[PDB]
Amino acid sequence: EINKIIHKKTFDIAWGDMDALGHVNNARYFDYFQEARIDWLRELDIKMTGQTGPVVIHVACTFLKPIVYPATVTIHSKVNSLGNSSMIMDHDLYQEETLMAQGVSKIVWIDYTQNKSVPLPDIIRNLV
Amino acid sequence: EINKIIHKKTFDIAWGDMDALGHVNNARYFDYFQEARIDWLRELDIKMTGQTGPVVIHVACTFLKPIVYPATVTIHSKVNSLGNSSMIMDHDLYQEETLMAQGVSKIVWIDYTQNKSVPLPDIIRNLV
Amino acid sequence: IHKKTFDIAWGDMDALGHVNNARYFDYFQEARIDWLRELDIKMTGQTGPVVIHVACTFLKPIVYPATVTIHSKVNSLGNSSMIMDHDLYQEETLMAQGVSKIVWIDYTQNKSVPLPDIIRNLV
Amino acid sequence: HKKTFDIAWGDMDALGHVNNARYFDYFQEARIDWLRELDIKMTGQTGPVVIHVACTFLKPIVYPATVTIHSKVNSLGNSSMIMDHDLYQEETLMAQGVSKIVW
Ligand SMILES: CC(C)(COP(=O)(O)OP(=O)(O)OC[C@H]1O[C@@H](n2cnc3c(N)ncnc32)[C@H](O)[C@@H]1OP(=O)(O)O)[C@@H](O)C(=O)NCCC(=O)NCCS
Ligand SMILES: CC(C)(COP(=O)(O)OP(=O)(O)OC[C@H]1O[C@@H](n2cnc3c(N)ncnc32)[C@H](O)[C@@H]1OP(=O)(O)O)[C@@H](O)C(=O)NCCC(=O)NCCS
Asked: What Pfam families has UniProt attached to this entry (chains A, B) (predicted)?
């Protein structure tokens, strides 16, 4: 239902993603989480194009082990907390078996033009 | 001394920082916080080069109002709670009088080569 | 005839301790977009510029910290096209030289339009 | 060398296409990968340094897109070399990068 792994994306880190001390910069993690989230929403008939859509209100990451080039990583994604307009999404970042990072993003649905929160769509509601 | 404003960075957003939705992409915020912080460490005569240095162990941001090109934004940074190896830095990012975001970063001091926790610099200790 | 000065971000560097080369194109792009915005040419509108060619010469590597200056000029005016130069100096040293050929087209219509006269005034 | 990959949505700028610098990121990554295959790493004291780089934009790339980069050594100087990265979407050539590299 809700807190199950609903999306798994595997990909490779670019060497230029690393900063001057030789590991992937922290913002790139949020880029990764971004692509995984967007891909899953793509799976769910939810688009960035429409008049109304999701916006990140909060996002966070816990770094347990550093990632160095080259590395093949897997992201396991689950959605946990649904408000009326808000939702929480979790991203687990693995290198091989080893778990490298923890992402948590609070996303809100809004009318982009009117920058006001709008309630959450039914298709995610169906994950109960 | 501690939760006092210890760094203030004012700058203009780059157009290329915006995503396909016509406002600044979320990771770019973490770039901003990262550079403000690094400038402050520079202010404490701390540079990223030495045998010992800061490592982000946690980072988070709350986005209150969207940012569009062009915009002049200010980051106000304070250090709030100090451990032996860890510290937290808070960032308020305003466009003019309005608050766009609030960032929280937990940083740990380590020996980079050995990947081990190391105590906080004394120059950081002076803010108590 | 235009100079944008700024400070290098530490995160612009790659794992080899120098500003990444693509980041230069980000810099030049920002200088160009800035200068066009100053002349009230905006990225928002239905019609706008599209870069068809861009190039950079790397003379000296840039390391954090560095305060750099970009000097942007349009050297050659076509009818629909233009050539713009962005030279990146760190104080007395010239660090990089970028050259971009730019044409104006309609994003919606995917079609050519002649040059504005105000750009002709950058001569 | 042939590197195929997929475009990230965040690679796009506010105009709905891949930002121009990211192409140089792509080319650079293809180069580094080929070097990795030939057991050449930037870690060592000796390595290639790009002195010139250029790109011609022929057709815009929109998300999603599966792109193939074909990279070859074009011209060998004594210290210099020219390297080409042609970026194709399927059969269509989308961009062409040319970089002059020395050691
Ligand atoms: C969304 C936004 C307009 C506020 O909308 P709103 O109409 O005022 O309604 P809310 O503030 O209550 O936001 C909705 C949810 O965000 C949550 N939220 C609000 N403040 C929060 C905070 N400081 N931290 C974490 N979550 C928060 C609320 O719990 C709320 O949950 P709900 O669905 O149960 O009501 C504002 O956050 C915003 O400007 N977002 C833009 C997003 C952005 O800047 N970048 C995203 C990438 S484009
Ligand atoms: C930072 C790091 C080396 C510490 O490793 P560790 O096994 O957690 O060692 P410790 O548990 O002793 O951590 C020590 C400090 O970090 C804190 N900490 C440890 N584990 C934590 C966790 N899971 N979550 C949040 N904080 C944690 C501790 O409170 C402690 O702070 P203190 O000195 O004030 O008491 C490790 O977490 C790591 O590899 N992080 C990613 C490295 C990196 O590249 N960061 C850059 C961002 S990309």
From this structure: 4HBT_2
Helical (H) or strand (E) element with D75: strand D66-76
Q: Token match 């290198």: residue?
A: A95
Q: CATH number of D1-103: 3.10.129.10, 3.40.50.920, 3.90.1150.10, 3.30.230.10?
A: 3.10.129.10
- Approach to solving: X-ray
Helix A26-43 to helix B26-43 angle, to the nearest 10 degrees?
Answer: 170
Pairing of strands A52-63, A98-111: antiparallel
CA B79/CA C10 separation, integer angstroms: 20
Determine the Cα–Cα distance for residues A110 and A86; give it in Å rounded to an integer. 10
Q: What is the Å distance from ligand 2's center to B108 Cα? A: 6
DSSP 8-state assignment for residue D30 = H
Q: How far apart are the first and last CA of chain A?
A: 5
Query: Does C23 touch chain D if contact means CB atoms closer than 8 Å?
Result: yes
Dihedral of alpha carbons D25, D61, D6, A52, sign: positive
A60, HSE (Cβ side, Cα atoms, 13 Å): 16
CA-CA distances (angstroms) from residue A100 to A24, A62, B32, C58? Answer: 11, 9, 23, 36
Q: Which residue in this structure is represented by tokens 């990146």?
A: C88
- A60 close to ligand 2 (CB < 6 Angstrom): no
Report domain extents, chain B: 1-128
Is C55 an interface residue toward D (CB < 8 Å)?
A: yes
Query: Which among A16, A8, A5 has a CA at the least distance from the CA of A69?
Result: A16
Please tell me if residue D14 touches chain B, with a CB cutoff of 8 Å.
yes
Residues B1-128, CATH architecture: Roll (3.10)
Best of B26, B65, B93 for a ligand 1 pocket test (most atoms within 8 Å of beta carbon)? B65
Q: Collapsing DSSP states into helix, strand and coil, what is residue D53?
A: strand
Distance CA A105, CA A109 (A): 13
**From the list A30, A58, A62, which residue is nearest B30 (CB)?**
A30
Residues C32 and C88 sit within 8 Å (Cβ to Cβ): no
Assign domain C1-123 to a CATH class: alpha beta
